[PDB]
Design an enzyme around this catalytic site. Structure first.
Site, PDB file in Angstrom:
ATOM      1  CG  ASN A  78      14.760  -5.715  43.411  1.00 27.60           C
ATOM      2  OD1 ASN A  78      15.927  -6.039  43.581  1.00 27.60           O
ATOM      3  ND2 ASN A  78      13.928  -5.476  44.411  1.00 27.60           N
ATOM      4  CG  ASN A 100      22.466  -9.853  42.873  1.00 33.31           C
ATOM      5  OD1 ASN A 100      23.037 -10.329  41.888  1.00 33.31           O
ATOM      6  ND2 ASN A 100      22.179  -8.558  42.981  1.00 33.31           N
ATOM      7  CB  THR A 101      18.634 -14.694  46.399  1.00 31.65           C
ATOM      8  OG1 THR A 101      19.003 -13.515  47.134  1.00 31.65           O
ATOM      9  CG2 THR A 101      18.666 -15.889  47.343  1.00 31.65           C
ATOM     10  CG  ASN A 115      23.333  -3.640  43.687  1.00 28.14           C
ATOM     11  OD1 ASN A 115      22.870  -3.038  42.715  1.00 28.14           O
ATOM     12  ND2 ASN A 115      22.578  -4.263  44.577  1.00 28.14           N
ATOM     13  CG  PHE A 141      18.495 -11.252  49.939  1.00 25.93           C
ATOM     14  CD1 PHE A 141      18.403 -10.264  48.962  1.00 25.93           C
ATOM     15  CD2 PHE A 141      17.367 -12.016  50.220  1.00 25.93           C
ATOM     16  CE1 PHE A 141      17.206 -10.037  48.309  1.00 25.93           C
ATOM     17  CE2 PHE A 141      16.173 -11.792  49.567  1.00 25.93           C
ATOM     18  CZ  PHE A 141      16.093 -10.799  48.607  1.00 25.93           C
ATOM     19  CB  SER A 144      17.103  -9.738  44.844  1.00 24.27           C
ATOM     20  OG  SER A 144      18.528  -9.777  44.809  1.00 24.27           O
ATOM     21  CE  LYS A 151      12.034  -2.766  45.017  1.00 29.30           C
ATOM     22  NZ  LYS A 151      12.803  -1.974  46.023  1.00 29.30           N
TER      23      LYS A 151
HETATM   24  C1  LIG Z   1      23.311  -1.777  46.613  1.00 24.06           C
HETATM   25  C2  LIG Z   1      21.843  -1.980  46.353  1.00 24.06           C
HETATM   26  C3  LIG Z   1      21.177  -2.767  47.276  1.00 24.06           C
HETATM   27  C4  LIG Z   1      19.826  -3.017  47.131  1.00 24.06           C
HETATM   28  N1  LIG Z   1      19.233  -3.795  48.054  1.00 24.06           N
HETATM   29  C5  LIG Z   1      17.917  -4.058  47.985  1.00 24.06           C
HETATM   30  C6  LIG Z   1      17.231  -4.892  48.999  1.00 24.06           C
HETATM   31  O1  LIG Z   1      17.848  -5.377  49.972  1.00 24.06           O
HETATM   32  N2  LIG Z   1      15.919  -5.125  48.845  1.00 24.06           N
HETATM   33  C7  LIG Z   1      15.213  -4.619  47.810  1.00 24.06           C
HETATM   34  O2  LIG Z   1      13.994  -4.874  47.735  1.00 24.06           O
HETATM   35  N3  LIG Z   1      15.772  -3.835  46.854  1.00 24.06           N
HETATM   36  C8  LIG Z   1      17.083  -3.522  46.880  1.00 24.06           C
HETATM   37  N4  LIG Z   1      17.668  -2.718  45.884  1.00 24.06           N
HETATM   38  C9  LIG Z   1      16.831  -2.217  44.790  1.00 24.06           C
HETATM   39  C10 LIG Z   1      16.378  -0.825  45.153  1.00 24.06           C
HETATM   40  O3  LIG Z   1      15.496  -0.967  46.267  1.00 24.06           O
HETATM   41  C11 LIG Z   1      15.668  -0.127  43.997  1.00 24.06           C
HETATM   42  O4  LIG Z   1      14.526  -0.907  43.641  1.00 24.06           O
HETATM   43  C12 LIG Z   1      16.525   0.051  42.744  1.00 24.06           C
HETATM   44  O5  LIG Z   1      17.828   0.480  43.115  1.00 24.06           O
HETATM   45  C13 LIG Z   1      15.930   1.054  41.767  1.00 24.06           C
HETATM   46  O6  LIG Z   1      15.818   2.336  42.384  1.00 24.06           O
HETATM   47  P1  LIG Z   1      16.581   3.669  41.897  1.00 24.06           P
HETATM   48  O7  LIG Z   1      17.057   3.444  40.483  1.00 24.06           O
HETATM   49  O8  LIG Z   1      15.541   4.759  42.083  1.00 24.06           O
HETATM   50  O9  LIG Z   1      17.720   3.747  42.862  1.00 24.06           O
HETATM   51  C14 LIG Z   1      19.057  -2.434  45.982  1.00 24.06           C
HETATM   52  C15 LIG Z   1      19.733  -1.642  45.048  1.00 24.06           C
HETATM   53  C16 LIG Z   1      21.094  -1.396  45.175  1.00 24.06           C
HETATM   54  C17 LIG Z   1      21.716  -0.522  44.107  1.00 24.06           C
HETATM   55  O1  LIG Z   2      21.074  -7.937  48.344  1.00 24.50           O
HETATM   56  C1  LIG Z   2      21.267  -7.703  47.125  1.00 24.50           C
HETATM   57  O2  LIG Z   2      22.327  -8.001  46.523  1.00 24.50           O
HETATM   58  C2  LIG Z   2      20.190  -7.075  46.325  1.00 24.50           C
HETATM   59  C3  LIG Z   2      18.881  -7.126  46.759  1.00 24.50           C
HETATM   60  C4  LIG Z   2      17.914  -6.542  45.965  1.00 24.50           C
HETATM   61  O3  LIG Z   2      16.723  -6.575  46.322  1.00 24.50           O
HETATM   62  N1  LIG Z   2      18.260  -5.940  44.818  1.00 24.50           N
HETATM   63  C5  LIG Z   2      19.542  -5.904  44.417  1.00 24.50           C
HETATM   64  O4  LIG Z   2      19.833  -5.333  43.334  1.00 24.50           O
HETATM   65  N2  LIG Z   2      20.500  -6.470  45.174  1.00 24.50           N
END
Ligand SMILES: Cc1cc2nc3c(=O)[nH]c(=O)nc-3n(C[C@H](O)[C@H](O)[C@H](O)COP(=O)(O)O)c2cc1C
Ligand SMILES: O=C(O)c1cc(=O)[nH]c(=O)[nH]1
Ligand SMILES: CC(C)=CCC/C(C)=C\CC/C(C)=C/Cc1c(O)c2ccccc2oc1=O
Length: 378
Positions: free
Chosen positions: A266, A182-183, A109, A113, A180, A237
């Site tokens: 992340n 993605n910034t 993904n 943000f 992330s 993070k």
């Molecule tokens: C669509 C999507 C959006 C995410 N958005 C954020 C976010 O806004 N902030 C953040 O710190 N992590 C974000 N993450 C990372 C998750 O918080 C997490 O660290 C990561 O998916 C690993 O966890 P998992 O494999 O147990 O799902 C995102 C992940 C995905 C897949």
């Molecule tokens: O906003 C996102 O695209 C995003 C945020 C984040 O913390 N981790 C990630 O995989 N995507």
């Protein structure tokens, strides 16, 4: 386990963004499942005074603008990490900007943000913070507030500053998202030299502690009300894709600053051959089952390099309380899920809690506190 993974005939997908939206619409307006089991007193953890009645919790990807954090949390979870809340609202990247990898049990993904603004999100924490005690007085749903920078501010140090000014007082634990992919060059703020400049700035706006008594738990909600005297445990993070050299720089700067914790990984921008699903070639960090050894080693490395004196909340392919058991054994006080729910489904909070508790029963020790890092007794 066998709900959506067995039943994935329908073409590529029912779109993930669309699904999540109409899911969160449901989350917003009650309309969800419910855990009833109260959780054994075994599963409670006091991470630096913070009572995590359950160590399982929703990661920062989900309730991105505090639409319904308590409702996810009444649905079995221990804690819920709230978005990445950028000061000014962002739209995000152009959609489709997010993909299930059914085969690989993963989710790439590139949302970027997409936030509502601290303008919008503060009121909703002002909402949650005062009614969270009220509604059903939960053994307070521990609350993560994750904050970042806008696309193109010169000093992220300012946007973390603003963040900590506004939405610090409600978080049981605050989180600086430097990870992330993605910034634009955000991940490159994890450097010894920058990381510090941020971490200190961020705990300097925490040093704004304001004064009161100067003109059941009915009214713990008054003052700056985080299941106690305000001060959130400060976190950062961090990435999964890092040198041992750069995990030093962090770990050093962690013990130098008196950072209250680290959230381990992340998403990862690695694409390990093994990914069979044809969406493997899309940009953005991937979550889920490919991020297993990645994350679980990153927990263990940051545990030892911080003497374990810094706290660890690991995300990254936590699928089953066995994965949680190992990440707890490797250093984690508590663990996070997100991509594991997109295949398991709502009552995965109840599952992972109990899969963990029985594998504690099998292992011998119950009451997790004894369990953490167990791997670092030789
Ligand atoms: C669509 C999507 C959006 C995410 N958005 C954020 C976010 O806004 N902030 C953040 O710190 N992590 C974000 N993450 C990372 C998750 O918080 C997490 O660290 C990561 O998916 C690993 O966890 P998992 O494999 O147990 O799902 C995102 C992940 C995905 C897949
Ligand atoms: O906003 C996102 O695209 C995003 C945020 C984040 O913390 N981790 C990630 O995989 N995507
Ligand atoms: C289609 C719809 C309006 C609601 C479906 C939710 C429901 C009641 C049951 C599960 C069905 C289903 C295929 C959900 C998919 C889903 C995601 O792909 C997804 C992807 C990223 C982030 C969150 C997500 O949440 C989901 O529920």
């Amino acid at each position: 386990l066998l709900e959506v993974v067995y039943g994935l005939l329908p073409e590529n997908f029912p779109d993930p963004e669309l699904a999540h939206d109409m899911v969160m619409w449901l989350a917003a307006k009650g309309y969800l499942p419910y855990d009833l089991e109260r959780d054994d007193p075994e599963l409670s953890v006091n991470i630096k005074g913070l009572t995590f009645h359950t160590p399982v919790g929703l990661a920062a990807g989900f309730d991105k603008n505090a639409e319904a954090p308590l409702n996810f949390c009444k649905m079995g979870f221990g804690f819920v990490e709230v978005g990445t809340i950028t000061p000014k609202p962002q739209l995000g990247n152009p959609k489709p900007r997010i993909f299930r990898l059914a085969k690989d049990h993963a989710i790439i993904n590139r949302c970027g943000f997409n936030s509502a603004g601290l303008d919008v999100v503060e009121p909703r924490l002002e909402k949650v913070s005062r009614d969270r005690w009220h509604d059903r007085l939960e053994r307070h749903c521990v609350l993560g507030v994750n904050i970042g920078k806008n696309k193109d501010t010169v000093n992220a140090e300012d946007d973390i500053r603003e963040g900590v000014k506004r939405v610090g007082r409600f978080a049981d634990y605050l989180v600086i998202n430097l990870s992330s992919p993605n910034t634009k060059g955000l991940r490159t703020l994890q450097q010894r030299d920058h990381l510090r400049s941020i971490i200190t700035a961020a705990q300097s706006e925490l040093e704004k502690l304001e004064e009161r008594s100067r003109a059941v738990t009915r009214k713990a909600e008054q003052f700056f009300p985080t299941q106690t005297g305000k001060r959130p445990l400060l976190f950062v993070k961090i990435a999964p894709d890092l040198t041992d050299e750069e995990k030093r720089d962090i770990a050093d700067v962690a013990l130098e600053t008196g950072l209250d914790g680290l959230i381990v990984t992340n998403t990862t921008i690695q694409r390990p051959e093994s990914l069979r699903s044809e969406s493997k070639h899309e940009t953005g960090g991937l979550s889920g089952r490919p991020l297993k050894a990645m994350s679980t080693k990153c927990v263990s490395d940051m545990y030892k390099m911080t003497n374990g004196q810094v706290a660890i909340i690991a995300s990254g392919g936590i699928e089953t309380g066995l994965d949680a058991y190992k990440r707890i054994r490797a250093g984690a006080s508590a663990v996070e899920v997100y991509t594991s729910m997109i295949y398991r489904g709502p009552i995965v909070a109840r599952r992972v809690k109990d899969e963990l508790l029985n594998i504690l029963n099998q292992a011998g020790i119950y009451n997790v506190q004894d369990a953490i890092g167990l791997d670092h007794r030789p």
